Design an enzyme around this catalytic site. Structure first.
Site, PDB file in Angstrom:
ATOM      1  N   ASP A   1       4.246  -4.034  -3.145  1.00 43.95           N
ATOM      2  CA  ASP A   1       3.926  -2.744  -3.748  1.00 43.95           C
ATOM      3  C   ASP A   1       2.719  -2.091  -3.074  1.00 43.95           C
ATOM      4  O   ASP A   1       2.669  -0.872  -2.913  1.00 43.95           O
ATOM      5  CB  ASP A   1       3.669  -2.902  -5.248  1.00 43.95           C
ATOM      6  CG  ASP A   1       3.686  -1.577  -5.985  1.00 43.95           C
ATOM      7  OD1 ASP A   1       2.640  -0.896  -6.012  1.00 43.95           O
ATOM      8  OD2 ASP A   1       4.747  -1.216  -6.537  1.00 43.95           O
TER       9      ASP A   1
ATOM     10  N   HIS B   1       4.105  -5.136 -13.734  1.00 47.87           N
ATOM     11  CA  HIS B   1       3.103  -5.253 -14.780  1.00 47.87           C
ATOM     12  C   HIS B   1       3.464  -6.160 -15.942  1.00 47.87           C
ATOM     13  O   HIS B   1       2.578  -6.774 -16.537  1.00 47.87           O
ATOM     14  CB  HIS B   1       2.621  -3.880 -15.216  1.00 47.87           C
ATOM     15  CG  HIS B   1       1.898  -3.162 -14.122  1.00 47.87           C
ATOM     16  ND1 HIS B   1       1.566  -1.828 -14.187  1.00 47.87           N
ATOM     17  CD2 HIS B   1       1.499  -3.595 -12.902  1.00 47.87           C
ATOM     18  CE1 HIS B   1       0.957  -1.482 -13.070  1.00 47.87           C
ATOM     19  NE2 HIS B   1       0.906  -2.537 -12.273  1.00 47.87           N
TER      20      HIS B   1
ATOM     21  N   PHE C   1       6.572   2.217   5.371  1.00 43.43           N
ATOM     22  CA  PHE C   1       7.234   1.104   6.025  1.00 43.43           C
ATOM     23  C   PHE C   1       6.651  -0.207   5.548  1.00 43.43           C
ATOM     24  O   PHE C   1       5.461  -0.281   5.237  1.00 43.43           O
ATOM     25  CB  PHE C   1       7.151   1.233   7.559  1.00 43.43           C
ATOM     26  CG  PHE C   1       7.597   2.585   8.078  1.00 43.43           C
ATOM     27  CD1 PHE C   1       6.665   3.536   8.467  1.00 43.43           C
ATOM     28  CD2 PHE C   1       8.936   2.912   8.154  1.00 43.43           C
ATOM     29  CE1 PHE C   1       7.053   4.779   8.938  1.00 43.43           C
ATOM     30  CE2 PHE C   1       9.346   4.165   8.622  1.00 43.43           C
ATOM     31  CZ  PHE C   1       8.419   5.091   8.992  1.00 43.43           C
TER      32      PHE C   1
ATOM     33  N   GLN D   1       3.259  -7.642  -6.064  1.00 43.01           N
ATOM     34  CA  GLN D   1       2.092  -6.768  -5.893  1.00 43.01           C
ATOM     35  C   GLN D   1       1.727  -6.583  -4.429  1.00 43.01           C
ATOM     36  O   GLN D   1       1.312  -5.497  -4.034  1.00 43.01           O
ATOM     37  CB  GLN D   1       0.909  -7.309  -6.687  1.00 43.01           C
ATOM     38  CG  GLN D   1      -0.236  -6.335  -6.843  1.00 43.01           C
ATOM     39  CD  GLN D   1      -1.393  -6.974  -7.541  1.00 43.01           C
ATOM     40  OE1 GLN D   1      -1.521  -8.190  -7.537  1.00 43.01           O
ATOM     41  NE2 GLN D   1      -2.230  -6.174  -8.167  1.00 43.01           N
TER      42      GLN D   1
HETATM   43  C1  HEM Z   1      -3.226  -8.715 -12.533  1.00 46.31           C
HETATM   44  C2  HEM Z   1      -2.373  -8.146 -11.638  1.00 46.31           C
HETATM   45  C3  HEM Z   1      -2.314  -6.594 -11.494  1.00 46.31           C
HETATM   46  C4  HEM Z   1      -3.289  -5.749 -11.751  1.00 46.31           C
HETATM   47  C5  HEM Z   1      -4.695  -6.131 -12.221  1.00 46.31           C
HETATM   48  C6  HEM Z   1      -2.822  -4.397 -11.557  1.00 46.31           C
HETATM   49  C7  HEM Z   1      -3.574  -3.239 -11.702  1.00 46.31           C
HETATM   50  C8  HEM Z   1      -3.206  -1.978 -11.327  1.00 46.31           C
HETATM   51  C9  HEM Z   1      -4.033  -0.761 -11.370  1.00 46.31           C
HETATM   52  C10 HEM Z   1      -5.498  -0.635 -11.862  1.00 46.31           C
HETATM   53  C11 HEM Z   1      -3.279   0.251 -10.928  1.00 46.31           C
HETATM   54  C12 HEM Z   1      -3.676   1.737 -10.757  1.00 46.31           C
HETATM   55  C13 HEM Z   1      -3.243   2.409 -12.040  1.00 46.31           C
HETATM   56  C14 HEM Z   1      -3.467   3.894 -12.002  1.00 46.31           C
HETATM   57  O1  HEM Z   1      -4.650   4.325 -12.000  1.00 46.31           O
HETATM   58  O2  HEM Z   1      -2.445   4.614 -11.982  1.00 46.31           O
HETATM   59  C15 HEM Z   1      -1.990  -0.297 -10.587  1.00 46.31           C
HETATM   60  C16 HEM Z   1      -0.967   0.429 -10.087  1.00 46.31           C
HETATM   61  C17 HEM Z   1       0.189  -0.075  -9.559  1.00 46.31           C
HETATM   62  N1  HEM Z   1       0.660  -1.358  -9.742  1.00 46.31           N
HETATM   63 FE1  HEM Z   1      -0.457  -2.917 -10.404  1.00 46.31          FE
HETATM   64  N2  HEM Z   1      -1.518  -4.469 -11.138  1.00 46.31           N
HETATM   65  C18 HEM Z   1      -1.173  -5.801 -11.096  1.00 46.31           C
HETATM   66  C19 HEM Z   1       0.067  -6.301 -10.757  1.00 46.31           C
HETATM   67  C20 HEM Z   1       1.089  -5.606 -10.230  1.00 46.31           C
HETATM   68  C21 HEM Z   1       2.393  -6.135  -9.876  1.00 46.31           C
HETATM   69  C22 HEM Z   1       2.805  -7.604 -10.090  1.00 46.31           C
HETATM   70  C23 HEM Z   1       3.110  -5.117  -9.346  1.00 46.31           C
HETATM   71  C24 HEM Z   1       4.546  -5.086  -8.784  1.00 46.31           C
HETATM   72  C25 HEM Z   1       5.439  -6.074  -8.786  1.00 46.31           C
HETATM   73  C26 HEM Z   1       2.267  -3.937  -9.394  1.00 46.31           C
HETATM   74  C27 HEM Z   1       2.607  -2.688  -8.992  1.00 46.31           C
HETATM   75  C28 HEM Z   1       1.852  -1.538  -9.061  1.00 46.31           C
HETATM   76  C29 HEM Z   1       2.207  -0.309  -8.409  1.00 46.31           C
HETATM   77  C30 HEM Z   1       3.450   0.016  -7.569  1.00 46.31           C
HETATM   78  C31 HEM Z   1       1.107   0.672  -8.734  1.00 46.31           C
HETATM   79  C32 HEM Z   1       1.030   2.126  -8.222  1.00 46.31           C
HETATM   80  C33 HEM Z   1       0.393   2.095  -6.821  1.00 46.31           C
HETATM   81  C34 HEM Z   1       0.233   3.484  -6.291  1.00 46.31           C
HETATM   82  O3  HEM Z   1       1.223   3.938  -5.694  1.00 46.31           O
HETATM   83  O4  HEM Z   1      -0.836   4.152  -6.457  1.00 46.31           O
HETATM   84  N3  HEM Z   1       1.054  -4.260  -9.949  1.00 46.31           N
HETATM   85  N4  HEM Z   1      -1.960  -1.644 -10.867  1.00 46.31           N
HETATM   86 CA   LIG Z   2       3.367  -0.086   4.657  1.00 49.48          CA
END
Ligand code: HEM
Ligand SMILES: [Ca+2]
Ligand SMILES: CC(=O)N[C@@H]1[C@@H](O)[C@H](O)[C@@H](CO)O[C@H]1O
Ligand SMILES: CC(=O)N[C@@H]1[C@@H](O)[C@H](O)[C@@H](CO)O[C@H]1O
Ligand SMILES: CC(=O)N[C@@H]1[C@@H](O)[C@H](O)[C@@H](CO)O[C@H]1O
Ligand SMILES: *[C@@H]1O[C@H](CO)[C@@H](O)[C@H](O)[C@H]1NC(C)=O
Length: 595
Positions: A108, A351, A186, A105
């Site tokens: 990311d 996720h 980056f 995360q």
């Molecule tokens: C409890 C832990 C985590 C929570 C609560 C969480 C929550 C969220 C939320 C609320 C979003 C925005 C969703 C949307 O409105 O489209 C999101 C997007 C995302 N999550 Fe997580 N996530 C978690 C863990 C992770 C992990 C472990 C990864 C990767 C290994 C990850 C990668 C991503 C990525 C790449 C996005 C899109 C970001 C963007 O480009 O806008 N997340 N997540």
């Molecule tokens: Ca960056």
């Protein structure tokens, strides 16, 4: 041929090539192309957008309009029928620490954000989507299916607001809708320093020139620092416990207090900055505010890169690792450093690596206190359990001593995230991150599962039997078929993740293709890649080669027992060692060869 960039937000691009340091915005990394990889630009398209109306309407928007002749299943229904599960037992990853999830995360968040549109922070319009479930203009609610338990306790939908898009923002309709990336492409540590010079300065401790990052003035962690509070009311972090009244932190990335462990990692990274900075002045008194800031920043970036590329990627991508990312050969200015739209969905595999609970462990790696183990859902935007409940140290011990969730085809995303997600300016812990990924997939005009299998040179199953064979699962394929009625319509987020893991990876072959390409592109297209000769010295690169996450804890927390290999499953005490026996970062090569 539509044009060379569409820019109305191209808000001052004057280029200094002559820098030993990155910009904050990412601009001027590619000197031949100055805006490549900068924040506040469109996400790259590796493949053309696929919207319902060709231009910018998501599949699923118009009841009667299909995809390849079929209705798209409702995000929430796919989430109930495929993503859900009840039994948390046996879902843990025996070869991955909880830090494998959390690092994911971190990275990311350094790489991409596509934040919701900004044409409504204080209107009726906002609460109109939460209150009335009216598919509107950028309101694209996630509707509950017939049988959904949430219909009994929440209402008819979950509120959902389309991602922002480049150039116009108040009324738009001419070229294909392209979502913005608000962070630098980056791997730079922009999650610690910010992607805007506005935010980047606000985080700096200007009041003295020691190149320190602005720390918290109202609370401490036994002699160690905290991120400063973001003071913007109203505050999601204050809302989750009106009595403790602790706000969210202020970080270079606004997502930092989303969940407590994210906020912990961010916390460690700032402590490293300042540690690094101070060790530098105790080397170089000559340097002023900037040289110390920039020079520790530069080191913070490289460590991020080395941990991701040396320790983290090889166990995400496994056998596929050196296939997509071969050894480094140097900066290739012809490579495209921008994050693809698709990547922002592919990296969401993370996720499925998130377990149902988070623990505090004490000095002996035993259950801190009478509330050691907490359900994940109570930790969204939870900053009080850090400050008012122990510091970050027992949580970090957790990160080492505990395991990520192993992704599982009959057990994909824990209900902590699937049923009980907390979102800011929403009052309830009742959202569905899965449903939200899936809405988001379609929001972003994602080509379906076979367009990406194609793009990766992989087979395209056309029939159930096809899908069973690829997914190596008879049951899941069948449910996917019933919901989607062609593997051409499977949402990339769900189809890439449904695939079985590659040998010594944690994603299947389609994701390893999407991930591998992208990480190769962020290494090669980066003028300031730590290992690009010219950025550090022969000597500086030899110290760097020593840095471990284990070390970062050691020198930034009151923990003194750590494993060697932070990312794999580590059990106390047969896998732990003292801070003592662990190669630190020898900061001498940064000693000024000037007077
Ligand atoms: C409890 C832990 C985590 C929570 C609560 C969480 C929550 C969220 C939320 C609320 C979003 C925005 C969703 C949307 O409105 O489209 C999101 C997007 C995302 N999550 Fe997580 N996530 C978690 C863990 C992770 C992990 C472990 C990864 C990767 C290994 C990850 C990668 C991503 C990525 C790449 C996005 C899109 C970001 C963007 O480009 O806008 N997340 N997540
Ligand atoms: Ca960056
Ligand atoms: C017991 C076991 O299989 N442990 C593996 C180890 O062999 C492997 O080298 C490491 C990845 O580097 O992850 C884990
Ligand atoms: C509902 C809830 O979480 N209440 C908590 C309370 O238990 C805790 O003692 C206090 C600490 O400041 O903060 C708040
Ligand atoms: C100069 C050089 O070696 N360039 C390589 C080449 O394979 C390719 O043309 C391009 C895109 O991958 O950039 C890199
Ligand atoms: C910055 O550091 C100085 C010296 O350590 C300290 O006195 C000051 O309180 C810090 N300021 C902020 C805003 O963190």
């Amino acid at each position: 041929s539509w044009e060379v960039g569409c820019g109305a937000p191209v808000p001052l691009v004057k280029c200094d090539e002559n820098s030993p340091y990155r910009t904050i915005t990412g601009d001027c990394n590619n000197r031949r192309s100055p805006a490549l990889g900068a924040a506040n630009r469109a996400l790259a398209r590796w493949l053309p957008a696929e919207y319902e109306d060709g231009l910018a309407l998501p599949f699923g928007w118009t009841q009667r309009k299909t995809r390849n002749g079929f209705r798209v299943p409702l995000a929430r229904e796919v989430s109930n029928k495929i993503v859900g599960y009840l039994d948390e037992e046996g879902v843990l990853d025996q070869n991955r620490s909880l830090l494998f999830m959390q690092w994911g995360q971190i990275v990311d968040h350094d790489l991409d954000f596509a934040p919701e549109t900004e044409l409504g922070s204080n209107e009726h319009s906002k609460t109109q989507c939460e209150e009335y479930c009216i598919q509107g203009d950028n309101c694209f609610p996630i509707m509950f299916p017939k049988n959904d338990p949430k219909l009994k306790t929440q209402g008819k939908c979950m509120p959902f607001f389309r991602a922002g898009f480049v150039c116009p923002t108040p009324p738009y309709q001419s070229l294909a809708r392209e979502q913005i990336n608000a962070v630098t492409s980056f791997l730079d540590a922009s999650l610690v320093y910010g992607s805007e010079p506005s935010l980047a300065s606000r985080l700096r401790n200007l009041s003295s020139p020691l190149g320190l990052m602005a720390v918290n003035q109202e609370a401490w962690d036994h002699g160690l620092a905290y991120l400063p509070f973001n003071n913007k009311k109203p505050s999601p972090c204050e809302f989750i416990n009106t009595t403790a009244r602790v706000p969210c932190f202020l970080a270079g990335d606004f997502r930092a207090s989303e969940q407590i462990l994210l906020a912990t990692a961010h916390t460690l990274l700032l402590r490293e900055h300042n540690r690094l900075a101070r060790e530098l002045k105790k080397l170089n008194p000559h340097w002023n505010g900037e040289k110390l800031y920039q020079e520790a920043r530069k080191i913070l970036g490289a460590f991020i890169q080395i941990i991701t590329f040396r320790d983290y990627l090889p166990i995400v991508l496994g056998s596929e690792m050196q296939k997509w990312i071969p050894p480094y050969q140097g900066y290739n200015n012809s490579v495209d450093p921008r994050i693809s739209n698709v990547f922002t969905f592919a990296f969401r595999f993370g996720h499925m690596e998130v377990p149902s609970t988070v623990s505090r462990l004490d000095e002996n790696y035993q259950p801190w206190g009478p509330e050691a183990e907490l359900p994940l859902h109570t930790l969204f935007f939870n900053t009080w359990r850090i400050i008012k409940d122990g510091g970050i140290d027992p949580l970090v011990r957790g990160l080492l001593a505990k395991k990520s969730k192993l992704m599982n085809q009959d057990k994909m995303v824990t209900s902590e995230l699937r049923n009980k997600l907390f979102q800011p300016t929403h009052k309830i812990h009742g959202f569905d991150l899965a449903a939200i990924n899936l809405q988001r997939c379609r929001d972003h005009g994602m080509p379906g599962y076979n367009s990406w299998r194609g793009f990766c040179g992989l087979s395209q199953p056309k029939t159930l039997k096809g899908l069973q064979t690829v997914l190596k699962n008879k049951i899941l394929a069948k449910k996917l078929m019933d919901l989607y009625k062609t593997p051409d319509n499977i949402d990339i987020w769900i189809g890439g993740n449904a695939e079985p893991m590659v040998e010594r990876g944690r994603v299947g072959p389609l994701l390893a293709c999407l991930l591998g390409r992208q990480f190769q592109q962020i290494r090669d297209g980066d003028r300031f890649w730590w290992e690009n000769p010219g950025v550090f010295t022969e000597k500086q690169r030899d110290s760097l080669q020593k840095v471990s996450f284990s070390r970062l804890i050691c020198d930034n927390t009151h923990i003194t027992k750590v494993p060697l290999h932070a990312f794999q499953a580590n059990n106390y005490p047969h896998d732990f060692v003292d801070c003592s026996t662990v190669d630190k970062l020898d900061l001498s090569p940064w000693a000024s060869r000037e007077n």
